[PDB]
């Protein structure tokens, strides 16, 4: 539920885009879901089929580029967490400060 | 109606002010944009504001400006009789 | 007809009843027939008056 | 057993139920996906406090402390008055147990989740008939 | 004009002749002159409404038993009235089937009859709208009349009203 | 007055004194979101029936 | 009860009617917006008297709307109900809860608790009716109802009546 | 979409009158009485009746209606509750004014 | 983008009363409330339906 209007095509089975793939605005980079307590209906559209809610991290709306790297590891508490880096090229234009 | 000064004792300027002209043109432009009967012949004009300017030039705007006074009294001045010199 | 993805174009159409139609997702029903008294929210064009400001 | 007070957004024109609804967050609109009719506009996206619904249930409290200007006499009496609350006393016991659980877990160099689970486990299994004749030390250790 | 906050207002009750803050005995017309409350019985109301409708019909074009009369009012009402006339249509139908005095002559006499009592305009309208056979019936149907007109005058007034009405 | 400084203190004093605000200045109308009596708002635009008949 | 009342209204005209014959449009709007309307203050406004002499004041153009607001003074006949009033009407409909009469432009509801004990509801008869030893109450029957209460909303009026008192009920 | 049509007349504010709430007015204005210091029931599913977030007071959730006016979040203006204090308390902003008045009038006969 | 107090002053100097209302109402928060004629409080329960 509450899935973002962006596109999840570039994500893999683990919810992470592999390095080297091109990304644009609204594209989900990190796919995450959390269980939802039953007995909560919003805008209708909530049937017995739905059991999760989207908690993904999309790319910045005004930024686009290519995923540089994706590292997966655990924090001090042992919980899974990941870092994703994106490359983009900036070319001088009108309005750039020098 | 003690707050309506008779036409014979009006003491305000006989000249339209910039704010009065701006609101009259905008007021009539909105009416034109909402399909109001245009009283001036059009030689080809689609912008409501330009039509209102044509009406003001030929004095075909059927509106009266109620100029208020600091004590609450008011004077009614027709657009046709107001001099547009600015 | 141009739509919100081609300047000059439009983004919304508002009927006299207050209903607003987003031109995106509205092309599925083909063209829309405008009527007098409706409002079309269209991209700002040349010669349009805008207020230009600099702070403080 | 209570009033519905539930609103379902459906397109009056399309009439298809359930409807295809797209939330234009950037535009702040809820629009029908088939015809484009807008069903709701002016959508909404420190002036608050961090609250945990599970381990603390519904318990709201505020502390009394010194400011830029303050006389020590007023602070002491107010704190004394706050402590002598019959209703807040019952929840303080659970909080006191949580504090001791936190101390034990912290001294064990255990992760935060382990401390959270121990506190939650105590709350769920506390105030029960079966566990009344058992020492609190055993209760805390079992939860940890 | 300054103390706008809530004040204890008398309840709207007909028995006490407390018609409210807007239906007081003294009324001011648009010009500003003081006028009395205009209360119309069923017969008077039918004539006033019809007199306006007939005049209304004349303005546009220029620039009997109950059954046939009901049809005559029906055709006139539609022609001389606009849309959303549901309430008016029922009103005219109700007035014809419940009015007691048909023409102006009988209606005029009724007004010429009951104004000598000096009662409230609401009370006199009630007397001309409800048909009462005995003083007790009028007293109970119109409690305000109590302690205002003696049974001697009331008995003769009702008797004359019944003898001034024919169908 | 509250728009400048001592917002809360002034408002409390008005409540105790039961002050009446006539909403003449820009600050009152700006707070209430209505056209202030300034510039174009210093007058009323009415419709002249005597002139409508004579423009046709 | 019927009264001749002096009333005022604020009418808004779209600019499309800002023509040489705008006064006629205002008169038409008054009939289409006042006649047949219900107001809790003045009651049901039935007919407008002196249609040819309606006082139309100067119109003020709304700042944002662009429409002209006109203060219209007119004389009209209004039916205003009152508590404690006695009226006659026709039973439009009947049901288990009660039967309601049709008095002019208003409908008065008669509840079972406001009815005499002898009268009882009978759903076996078509149409349903309240039957008693002395009389039977059915649709289209004539009833003398006393209004025991009135609730007046800004655009709606509802009343409840009783026939327990003497000289009431079937006429 | 915009707000729903209303039959009430539309006017412009002409005057603002300040003042103080009487204890009677607060009770009359209030739509519900708050007696529980909690916000949600034991299930943390719906707001507790009589609590701080009583449904009768209004709604701030886009999916819930107001139990009073049965209107959406964008239409409900909010409804006021009231708490009956056990003992009277001073208004922090009027303590200075109260002190001045107390000196002005007698503390026994109030003259 | 903030239309601050200083911006409001300039429009006041310009005399654009209608524009100032448009920025503060149509281009920003706009709300309709019901008030009682006896008491000027927004405590009217309106059943619009
Ligand atoms: Zn649709
Ligand atoms: Zn509400
Ligand atoms: Zn009030």
UniProtKB/Swiss-Prot annotation, chain B:
Coiled coil regions in record: none
Where in or outside the cell it occurs: the entry states: Cytoplasm; Nucleus
Molecular function (GO) terms for this protein are: DNA binding; DNA-directed RNA polymerase activity
Look up the record and report any one GO term of the cellular component aspect. RNA polymerase III complex
Q: Which keywords accompany this UniProt record?
A: Cytoplasm, DNA-directed RNA polymerase, Nucleus, Phosphoprotein, Ribosome biogenesis, Transcription
Q: What GO terms in the biological process aspect are recorded for it?
A: nucleolar large rRNA transcription by RNA polymerase I; ribosome biogenesis; RNA-templated transcription; termination of RNA polymerase I transcription; termination of RNA polymerase III transcription; transcription by RNA polymerase I; transcription by RNA polymerase II; transcription by RNA polymerase III
Keyword hit for Transcription regulation: no
| Keyword Transcription among record annotations | yes
Q: Where is this region: Leucine-zipper?
A: 42-63
Entry's family note: Belongs to the archaeal Rpo6/eukaryotic RPB6 RNA polymerase subunit family.
| Subunit and partners | Component of the RNA polymerase I (Pol I), RNA polymerase II (Pol II) and RNA polymerase III (Pol III) complexes. Component of the RNA polymerase I (Pol I) complex consisting of 14 subunits: RPA135, RPA190, RPC40, RPA14, RPB5, RPO26, RPA43, RPB8, RPA12, RPB10, RPC19, RPC10, RPA49 and RPA34. The complex is composed of a horseshoe-shaped core containing ten subunits (RPA135, RPA190, RPB5, RPO26, RPB8, RPB10, RPC10, RPA12, RPC19 and RPC40) where RPA135 and RPA190 form the DNA-binding cleft.
In the UniProt entry for this protein, what further remark is given in the free-text comments?
A: Present with 6090 molecules/cell in log phase SD medium.
Please report the name of this protein according to its UniProt entry.
Answer: DNA-directed RNA polymerases I, II, and III subunit RPABC2
Q: Which organism is it from?
A: Saccharomyces cerevisiae (strain ATCC 204508 / S288c)
Swiss-Prot record, chain D:
Where, by residue number, does Zn(2+) bind? 11, 14, 32, 35
Which compartments does it reside in? Nucleus
- Zinc fingers classed as TFIIB-type: ranges: 7-40
Note, other: Present with 6750 molecules/cell in log phase SD medium.
Q: Which family does it belong to?
A: Belongs to the TFIIB family.
As for what it does, the entry says:
General factor that plays a major role in the activation of eukaryotic genes transcribed by RNA polymerase II.
Q: How does it assemble?
A: Associates with TFIID-IIA (DA complex) to form TFIID-IIA-IIB (DAB-complex) which is then recognized by polymerase II.
What protein does this entry describe? Answer: Transcription initiation factor IIB
Organism, per UniProt? Saccharomyces cerevisiae (strain ATCC 204508 / S288c) (Baker's yeast)
Swiss-Prot record, chain G:
Any Pfam family: SHS2_Rpb7-N
From what superkingdom does this record's organism come? Eukaryota
Q: What InterPro entries would the database entry show?
A: NA-bd_OB-fold, RNA_pol_Rpb7-like_N_sf, Rpb7-like, Rpb7-like_N, S1_domain
What GO terms describe the biological role, i.e. biological process, of this protein?
A: DNA-templated transcription initiation; nuclear-transcribed mRNA catabolic process; nuclear-transcribed mRNA catabolic process, deadenylation-dependent decay; positive regulation of nuclear-transcribed mRNA poly(A) tail shortening; positive regulation of translational initiation; RNA-templated transcription; transcription by RNA polymerase II; transcription elongation by RNA polymerase II
Q: Which UniProt keywords apply?
A: Cytoplasm, DNA-directed RNA polymerase, Nucleus, Transcription
The GO terms describing molecular function are: single-stranded DNA binding; single-stranded RNA binding; translation initiation factor binding
List the CDD domains hit by this protein, alphabetically. RNAP_II_Rpb7_N (cd04329), S1_RNAPII_Rpb7 (cd04462)
Compartments annotated for it: namely: Nucleus; Cytoplasm; Cytoplasm, P-body
The signal sequence is: none
Chief location category: nucleus
GO CC, sorted alphabetically, is: cytoplasm; nucleus; P-body; RNA polymerase II, core complex; RPB4-RPB7 complex
Q: Which PANTHER family match?
A: DNA-DIRECTED RNA POLYMERASE II SUBUNIT RPB7, DNA-DIRECTED RNA POLYMERASE II, III
Additional remark text: Present with 6420 molecules/cell in log phase SD medium.
Q: Which family does it belong to?
A: Belongs to the eukaryotic RPB7/RPC8 RNA polymerase subunit family.
- Name of the protein described by the UniProt record: DNA-directed RNA polymerase II subunit RPB7
Swiss-Prot record, chain I:
Which compartments is it annotated to reside in? Nucleus
What name goes with this protein?
DNA-directed RNA polymerase II subunit RPB2
Which annotated residues bind Zn(2+)?
36, 39
Origin species? Saccharomyces cerevisiae (strain ATCC 204508 / S288c)
Task performed by this protein: DNA-dependent RNA polymerase catalyzes the transcription of DNA into RNA using the four ribonucleoside triphosphates as substrates. Second largest component of RNA polymerases II which synthesizes mRNA precursors and many functional non-coding RNAs. Proposed to contribute to the polymerase catalytic activity and forms the polymerase active center together with the largest subunit. Pol II is the central component of the basal RNA polymerase II transcription machinery.
Task: Describe its partners and assembly state.
Answer: Component of the RNA polymerase II (Pol II) complex consisting of 12 subunits.
Zinc fingers (C4-type): give the ranges.
Answer: 36-49
What family is it from?
Belongs to the RNA polymerase beta chain family.
Q: What else is known?
A: The binding of ribonucleoside triphosphate to the RNA polymerase II transcribing complex probably involves a two-step mechanism. The initial binding seems to occur at the entry (E) site and involves a magnesium ion coordinated by three conserved aspartate residues of the two largest RNA Pol II subunits. Present with 18700 molecules/cell in log phase SD medium.
């Amino acid at each position: 539920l509450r899935m973002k209007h962006g596109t999840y095509d570039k994500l893999d089975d683990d919810g992470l885009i592999a390095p080297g793939v091109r990304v644009s605005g609204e594209d989900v980079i990190i796919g995450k879901t959390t269980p939802i307590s039953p007995d909560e209906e919003e805008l209708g559209q909530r049937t017995a089929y739905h059991s999760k809610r989207d908690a993904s991290t999309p790319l910045r709306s005004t930024e686009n580029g290519i995923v540089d790297q994706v590292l997966v590891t655990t924090n001090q508490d042992g919980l899974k967490f990941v870092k994703v880096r994106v490359r983009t090229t900036k070319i001088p234009q009108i309005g750039d400060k020098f | 109606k003690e707050k309506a000064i008779p036409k014979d004792q009006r003491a305000t300027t006989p000249y339209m002010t910039k704010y009065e002209r701006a609101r009259i043109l905008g007021t009539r432009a909105l009416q034109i944009s909402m399909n109001a009967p245009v009283f001036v012949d059009l030689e080809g004009e689609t912008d409501p504001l330009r039509i209102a300017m044509k009406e003001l030039a030929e004095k075909k705007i059927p509106l009266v400006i109620r100029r208020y006074l600091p004590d609450g009294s008011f004077e009614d001045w027709s657009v046709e009789e107001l001099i547009v010199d600015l | 007809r141009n739509g919100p993805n081609e300047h000059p174009g439009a983004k919304y159409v508002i009927r006299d009843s207050g209903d607003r139609i987003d031109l995106r997702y509205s092309k599925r029903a083909g063209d829309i027939q405008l009527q007098y008294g409706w409002k079309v929210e269209r991209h700002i064009m040349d010669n349009d008056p805008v207020l230009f400001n600099r702070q403080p | 057993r209570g009033p519905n007070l539930n609103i379902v957004l459906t397109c009056p024109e399309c009439k298809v139920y359930p409807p295809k609804i797209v939330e234009r967050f950037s535009e702040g609109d809820v629009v029908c996906a088939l015809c484009g009719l807008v069903l709701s506009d002016k959508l909404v996206d420190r002036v608050g406090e961090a609250s945990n619904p599970l381990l603390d249930g519904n318990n709201l409290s505020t502390r009394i402390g010194k400011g830029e200007t303050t006389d020590m006499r007023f602070t002491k009496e107010l704190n004394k008055a706050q402590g002598k609350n019959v209703m807040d006393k019952k929840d303080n016991e659970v909080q006191a147990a949580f504090a001791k659980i936190t101390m034990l877990c912290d001294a064990a160099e255990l992760p935060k989740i382990v401390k959270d689970c121990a506190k939650e486990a105590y709350k769920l299994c506390h105030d029960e008939k079966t566990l009344k004749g058992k020492s609190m030390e055993s209760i805390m250790a079992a939860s940890i | 004009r300054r103390r706008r906050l809530k004040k204890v207002e008398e309840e709207e009750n007909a028995a006490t002749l407390q018609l409210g803050q807007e239906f007081q005995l003294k009324q001011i017309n648009h010009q500003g002159e003081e006028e009395e409350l205009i209360a119309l019985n069923l017969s008077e109301a039918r004539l006033v409404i019809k007199e306006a409708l007939v005049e209304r019909r004349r303005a546009f074009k220029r620039s009997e038993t109950r059954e046939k009369e009901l049809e005559s009012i029906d055709v006139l009402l539609e022609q001389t009235t606009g849309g959303n006339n549901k309430d008016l249509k029922n009103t005219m139908q109700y007035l014809t089937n419940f009015s007691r005095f048909r023409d102006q002559e009988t209606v005029g006499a009724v007004i010429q009859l009951l104004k000598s009592t000096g009662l409230h305009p609401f009370e006199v309208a009630q007397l001309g709208s409800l048909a009462c056979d005995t003083a007790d019936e009028a007293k109970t149907l119109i409690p305000s009349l109590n302690n205002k007109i003696s049974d001697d005058e009331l008995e003769r007034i009702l008797k004359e009203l019944s003898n001034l009405e024919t169908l | 007055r509250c728009s400048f400084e001592e917002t809360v203190e002034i408002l409390f004093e008005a409540g105790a004194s039961a002050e009446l605000d006539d909403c003449r200045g820009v600050s009152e109308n700006v707070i209430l979101g209505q056209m202030a009596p300034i510039g174009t708002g210093a007058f009323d635009v009415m419709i002249d029936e005597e002139s409508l008949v004579k423009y046709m | 009860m019927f009264f001749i009342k002096d009333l005022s209204l604020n009418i808004t005209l779209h600019p499309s009617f800002f023509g040489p014959r705008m006064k006629q449009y205002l008169k038409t709007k008054l009939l289409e917006e006042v006649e047949g309307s219900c107001t809790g203050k003045f009651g049901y406004i039935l007919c407008v008297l002196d249609y040819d002499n309606i006082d139309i004041q100067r119109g003020r153009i709304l700042p944002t709307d662009g429409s002209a607001e006109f203060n219209v003074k007119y004389r009209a006949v209004v039916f205003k109900p009152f508590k404690g009033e006695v009226v006659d009407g026709t039973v439009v409909s009947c049901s288990q809860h009660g039967f309601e009469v049709q008095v002019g432009p208003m409908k008065v509801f008669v509840t079972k608790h406001l009815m005499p004990q002898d009268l009882t509801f009978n759903a076996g008869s078509n149409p349903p009716s309240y039957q008693s030893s002395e009389d039977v109450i059915t649709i289209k029957s004539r009833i003398r109802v006393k209004i025991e209460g009135c609730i007046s909303q800004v655009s709606s009026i509802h009343a409840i009546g009783s026939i327990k008192e003497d000289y009431l009920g079937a006429i | 979409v915009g707000q729903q049509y209303s039959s009430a007349p539309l006017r412009t504010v002409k005057e603002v009158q300040f003042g103080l709430f009487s204890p009677e007015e607060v009770r009359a204005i209030s739509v519900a009485k708050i007696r529980f210091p909690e916000t949600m029931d034991e299930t943390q599913t719906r707001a507790k009746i009589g609590g701080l977030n009583d449904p009768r007071l209004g709604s701030i959730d886009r999916n819930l209606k107001c139990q009073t006016c049965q209107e959406g979040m964008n239409e409900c203006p909010g409804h006021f509750g009231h708490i009956d204090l056990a003992k009277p308390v001073f208004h922090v902003g009027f303590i200075a004014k109260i002190k001045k008045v107390c000196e002005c009038v007698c503390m026994h006969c109030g003259k | 983008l903030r239309f601050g107090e200083m911006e409001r002053d300039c429009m006041i100097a310009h005399g654009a009363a209608s524009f100032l209302k448009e920025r503060l109402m149509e281009a920003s928060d706009a709300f309709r409330v019901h008030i009682c004629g006896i008491c000027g409080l927004m405590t009217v329960i309106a059943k619009l339906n």
